[PDB]
Amino acid sequence: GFYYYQRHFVDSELECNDVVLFWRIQRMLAITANTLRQQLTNTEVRRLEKN
């Protein structure tokens, strides 16, 4: 239950801030990787060829 997390009734009830944390950093790492890749393939590789 993600809903049990949403409940946040008590510690004994599921308190899954941990899953949402690791999800957030999942997003951070994936988006960082794709941004770096995009700059590489559309900006830096052509500059590399020129150099």
Partner: protein, 51 residues
Amino acid sequence: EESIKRHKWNDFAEDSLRVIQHNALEDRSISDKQQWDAAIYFMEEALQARL
């Protein structure tokens, strides 16, 4: 009659209430069955009157 006219309510309440009211609304989280039932009760009452 006279005692009423010599009294005035402190208008600043309008601003304080604005904060306080928001806070009471701000809790959108029904964490357990008891508050779920209280919530359904008030919703049923308010909607039944208009119905």
